[PDB]
Tab-separated table of C-alpha atoms in Angstrom:
chain	number	residue	atom	x	y	z
Q	1	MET	CA	-89.613	60.873	-99.929
Q	2	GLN	CA	-86.850	59.016	-101.424
Q	3	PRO	CA	-83.624	59.631	-98.699
Q	4	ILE	CA	-82.360	56.956	-96.175
Q	5	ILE	CA	-82.602	57.862	-93.109
Q	6	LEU	CA	-81.887	56.040	-89.861
Q	7	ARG	CA	-84.317	56.314	-86.987
Q	8	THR	CA	-84.177	53.405	-84.454
Q	9	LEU	CA	-80.337	52.652	-84.202
Q	10	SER	CA	-79.138	49.765	-81.118
Q	11	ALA	CA	-77.134	51.517	-78.442
Q	12	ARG	CA	-73.837	51.247	-77.061
Q	13	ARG	CA	-74.418	49.175	-73.713
Q	14	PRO	CA	-75.131	45.219	-74.214
Q	15	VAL	CA	-78.446	43.665	-73.461
Q	16	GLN	CA	-76.707	42.149	-70.263
Q	17	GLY	CA	-78.135	42.931	-66.469
Q	18	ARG	CA	-75.789	44.895	-64.037
Q	19	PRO	CA	-72.425	43.270	-62.419
Q	20	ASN	CA	-72.472	42.465	-58.943
Q	21	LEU	CA	-70.439	44.656	-56.390
Q	22	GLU	CA	-69.772	42.341	-53.714
Q	23	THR	CA	-65.749	43.208	-54.099
Q	24	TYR	CA	-66.510	46.831	-54.605
Q	25	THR	CA	-68.901	46.245	-51.062
Q	26	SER	CA	-66.284	44.788	-49.662
Q	27	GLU	CA	-63.929	47.539	-50.302
Q	28	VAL	CA	-66.368	50.301	-48.915
Q	29	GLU	CA	-66.685	48.108	-45.976
Q	30	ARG	CA	-62.851	48.408	-44.969
Q	31	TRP	CA	-62.933	52.369	-46.206
Q	32	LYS	CA	-66.045	52.698	-43.246
Q	33	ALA	CA	-63.635	50.357	-41.234
Q	34	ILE	CA	-60.697	52.460	-41.351
Q	35	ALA	CA	-63.117	55.861	-40.786
Q	36	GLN	CA	-64.287	54.526	-37.618
Q	37	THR	CA	-61.420	54.007	-35.700
Q	38	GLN	CA	-60.264	56.827	-36.190
Q	39	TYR	CA	-63.519	58.423	-34.548
Q	40	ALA	CA	-63.363	55.304	-31.644
Q	41	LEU	CA	-59.812	56.292	-31.137
Q	42	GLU	CA	-61.274	59.289	-29.987
Q	43	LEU	CA	-64.202	58.196	-28.024
Q	44	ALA	CA	-61.931	55.511	-26.379
Q	45	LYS	CA	-59.408	58.394	-25.060
Q	46	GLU	CA	-62.363	59.513	-22.936
Q	47	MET	CA	-63.028	56.291	-21.846
Q	48	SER	CA	-59.311	55.937	-19.800
Q	49	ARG	CA	-59.593	59.125	-18.341
Q	50	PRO	CA	-60.220	58.705	-14.170
Q	51	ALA	CA	-63.138	58.644	-12.494
Q	52	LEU	CA	-64.467	61.421	-10.024
Q	53	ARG	CA	-62.499	64.568	-11.129
Q	54	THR	CA	-64.818	66.407	-12.680
X	1	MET	CA	-72.838	60.035	22.677
X	2	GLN	CA	-71.506	58.413	25.322
X	3	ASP	CA	-68.326	59.189	27.672
X	4	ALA	CA	-66.607	56.950	29.789
X	5	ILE	CA	-68.704	57.318	32.598
X	6	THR	CA	-71.912	56.875	30.537
X	7	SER	CA	-69.979	53.798	28.849
X	8	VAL	CA	-69.537	52.538	32.388
X	9	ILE	CA	-73.012	52.934	33.589
X	10	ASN	CA	-74.063	51.319	30.441
X	11	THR	CA	-72.347	48.257	31.080
X	12	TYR	CA	-73.525	48.245	34.650
X	13	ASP	CA	-77.156	49.042	33.716
X	14	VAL	CA	-77.519	46.078	31.115
X	15	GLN	CA	-77.057	43.593	34.026
X	16	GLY	CA	-79.091	45.939	36.782
X	17	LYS	CA	-76.218	45.961	38.661
X	18	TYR	CA	-75.456	48.447	41.468
X	19	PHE	CA	-71.329	49.750	41.134
X	20	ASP	CA	-68.419	47.621	42.710
X	21	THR	CA	-65.688	48.358	43.543
X	22	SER	CA	-64.010	47.439	39.852
X	23	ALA	CA	-67.189	50.178	38.925
X	24	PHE	CA	-65.483	52.739	40.997
X	25	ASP	CA	-61.695	52.184	40.116
X	26	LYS	CA	-63.176	52.815	36.663
X	27	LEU	CA	-64.470	56.029	37.927
X	28	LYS	CA	-61.508	57.097	39.778
X	29	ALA	CA	-59.519	56.363	36.335
X	30	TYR	CA	-61.439	58.912	34.598
X	31	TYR	CA	-62.014	61.640	37.236
X	32	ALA	CA	-57.565	61.422	37.759
X	33	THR	CA	-56.984	61.931	34.135
X	34	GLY	CA	-59.612	65.144	33.653
X	35	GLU	CA	-56.839	67.210	34.235
X	36	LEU	CA	-54.883	66.354	32.151
X	37	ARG	CA	-57.650	66.019	29.367
X	38	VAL	CA	-58.848	70.257	29.909
X	39	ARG	CA	-55.244	71.441	30.074
X	40	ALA	CA	-54.851	69.086	26.587
X	41	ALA	CA	-58.001	70.725	24.784
X	42	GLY	CA	-57.658	74.152	25.976
X	43	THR	CA	-53.811	73.877	23.941
X	44	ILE	CA	-55.160	71.995	21.138
X	45	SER	CA	-57.976	75.083	20.939
X	46	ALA	CA	-55.342	77.709	21.395
X	47	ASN	CA	-53.089	76.238	18.642
X	48	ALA	CA	-55.489	74.291	16.642
X	49	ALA	CA	-55.393	76.505	13.289
X	50	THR	CA	-51.538	76.041	13.760
X	51	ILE	CA	-51.977	72.460	13.876
X	52	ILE	CA	-53.854	72.174	10.833
X	53	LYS	CA	-51.377	74.140	8.522
X	54	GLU	CA	-48.585	72.359	9.818
X	55	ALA	CA	-50.517	69.093	9.516
X	56	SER	CA	-51.739	69.616	5.555
X	57	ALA	CA	-48.250	70.967	5.090
X	58	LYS	CA	-46.910	67.669	5.842
X	59	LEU	CA	-49.689	65.602	3.826
X	60	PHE	CA	-49.390	67.585	1.056
X	61	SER	CA	-45.231	67.514	1.195
X	62	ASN	CA	-45.656	63.659	1.068
X	63	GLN	CA	-48.290	63.227	-1.402
X	64	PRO	CA	-47.854	66.088	-3.980
X	65	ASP	CA	-49.786	64.611	-6.210
X	66	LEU	CA	-52.749	65.544	-4.366
X	67	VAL	CA	-52.533	69.482	-5.023
X	68	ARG	CA	-51.440	68.880	-8.357
X	69	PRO	CA	-53.609	68.775	-11.540
X	70	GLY	CA	-55.670	65.568	-11.611
X	71	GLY	CA	-55.519	65.550	-7.609
X	72	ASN	CA	-58.168	65.133	-5.670
X	73	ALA	CA	-56.868	68.470	-3.614
X	74	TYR	CA	-56.735	70.687	-7.061
X	75	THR	CA	-59.403	72.707	-6.720
X	76	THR	CA	-59.530	75.932	-4.166
X	77	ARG	CA	-62.531	73.693	-3.508
X	78	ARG	CA	-61.082	70.542	-2.471
X	79	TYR	CA	-58.486	72.471	-1.033
X	80	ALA	CA	-60.833	73.950	1.293
X	81	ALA	CA	-62.730	70.668	1.492
X	82	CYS	CA	-59.381	68.342	2.604
X	83	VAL	CA	-58.484	70.944	5.349
X	84	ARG	CA	-62.134	71.987	6.229
X	85	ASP	CA	-62.184	67.771	6.993
X	86	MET	CA	-58.964	68.156	9.082
X	87	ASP	CA	-60.376	70.652	11.464
X	88	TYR	CA	-63.345	68.505	11.692
X	89	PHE	CA	-60.768	65.500	12.865
X	90	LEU	CA	-58.822	67.408	15.153
X	91	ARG	CA	-61.936	68.971	16.739
X	92	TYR	CA	-63.982	65.528	17.180
X	93	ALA	CA	-60.579	63.980	18.683
X	94	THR	CA	-61.023	66.850	20.906
X	95	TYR	CA	-63.961	66.215	21.611
X	96	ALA	CA	-63.278	62.200	22.580
X	97	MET	CA	-59.811	62.932	23.769
X	98	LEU	CA	-61.847	65.019	26.717
X	99	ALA	CA	-64.958	62.723	26.681
X	100	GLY	CA	-62.325	59.891	27.243
X	101	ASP	CA	-64.500	57.534	25.065
X	102	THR	CA	-64.832	56.770	21.222
X	103	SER	CA	-68.365	56.587	21.072
X	104	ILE	CA	-68.048	60.693	19.175
X	105	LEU	CA	-65.841	59.259	16.620
X	106	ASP	CA	-68.486	56.291	15.501
X	107	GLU	CA	-71.598	58.054	15.951
X	108	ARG	CA	-70.695	61.609	14.376
X	109	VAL	CA	-67.292	61.187	12.522
X	110	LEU	CA	-67.223	57.745	10.946
X	111	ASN	CA	-70.600	56.615	10.548
X	112	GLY	CA	-70.705	56.589	6.192
X	113	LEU	CA	-67.346	58.011	6.421
X	114	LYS	CA	-65.476	55.078	4.280
X	115	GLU	CA	-68.796	54.629	2.092
X	116	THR	CA	-69.161	58.676	1.372
X	117	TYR	CA	-65.188	59.287	0.610
X	118	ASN	CA	-65.457	56.418	-1.952
X	119	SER	CA	-68.711	57.904	-3.488
X	120	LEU	CA	-66.680	60.759	-3.959
X	121	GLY	CA	-63.640	59.640	-4.911
X	122	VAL	CA	-61.339	60.815	-1.940
X	123	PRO	CA	-57.913	58.728	-0.935
X	124	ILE	CA	-58.939	57.206	1.382
X	125	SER	CA	-55.054	56.179	2.185
X	126	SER	CA	-54.191	60.187	1.628
X	127	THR	CA	-56.745	60.839	4.770
X	128	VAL	CA	-55.504	58.233	6.893
X	129	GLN	CA	-51.888	60.255	6.338
X	130	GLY	CA	-53.287	63.057	6.924
X	131	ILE	CA	-54.698	61.827	10.366
X	132	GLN	CA	-51.283	60.797	11.278
X	133	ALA	CA	-49.856	64.318	10.487
X	134	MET	CA	-51.870	65.913	12.723
X	135	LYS	CA	-51.088	62.999	15.363
X	136	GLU	CA	-47.385	63.459	15.090
X	137	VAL	CA	-48.193	67.754	15.355
X	138	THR	CA	-50.642	67.461	18.222
X	139	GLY	CA	-48.393	65.151	20.088
X	140	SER	CA	-45.420	67.829	19.727
X	141	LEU	CA	-48.091	70.419	20.741
X	142	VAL	CA	-49.313	68.933	23.741
X	143	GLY	CA	-46.350	66.618	25.230
X	144	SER	CA	-46.253	63.387	26.779
X	145	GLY	CA	-49.217	62.103	28.629
X	146	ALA	CA	-51.447	64.571	26.279
X	147	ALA	CA	-50.515	62.981	23.101
X	148	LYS	CA	-50.553	59.471	24.122
X	149	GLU	CA	-54.114	60.185	24.929
X	150	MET	CA	-54.621	62.409	21.708
X	151	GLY	CA	-52.992	59.138	19.926
X	152	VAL	CA	-55.776	56.896	21.170
X	153	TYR	CA	-58.076	58.671	19.031
X	154	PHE	CA	-56.531	59.409	16.272
X	155	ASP	CA	-55.414	55.854	15.645
X	156	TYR	CA	-59.238	54.995	16.166
X	157	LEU	CA	-59.516	57.419	13.226
X	158	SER	CA	-57.481	56.047	11.051
X	159	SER	CA	-58.687	52.348	11.904
X	160	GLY	CA	-62.087	53.340	10.804
X	161	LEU	CA	-60.906	54.806	7.420
X	162	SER	CA	-58.076	51.827	7.045
């Protein structure tokens, strides 16, 4: 058995840990706020109706 | 309820007094107007539906928003309740005019009415306007003296609501 066969090649990924996601989390919170506004607008439209006219 | 005679009787009963000259004068004042009150009540009863129709027309002409959507007289049920309320007001005003005393208006009509209208969303000022419309139509129908007499009880109703 004399062919050179390579068994354990190192991977592409680096050894470091996961970079933090604070800026991504902030932008996601911005999207959440935008999405909450579009439902809050409808419910607010509901809030401004007259009192006893059912 | 209490009429003019029972009102005087009560004022003398709380004092334990027999009738004096002034009491007999008040009783004569009430007895002297009895034929006028009876004729007025008969005339009002004969034409009550006409009075209600004319006064409701006046009220809704002066306030068209009442019967359009969003108004408190917009549905067949709320319109019916409104004209029924006006019919009650006319009838009990006739009762009080015949009794010569506003006690029945307190006892059966005004006690709890403002709270009721607040709890239902009934506009008070519009109801007062409808009462004034009935005042005008009724006076035109019953003539000068009977109109001055029914005015007292219409104004008592309006003041109780206002």
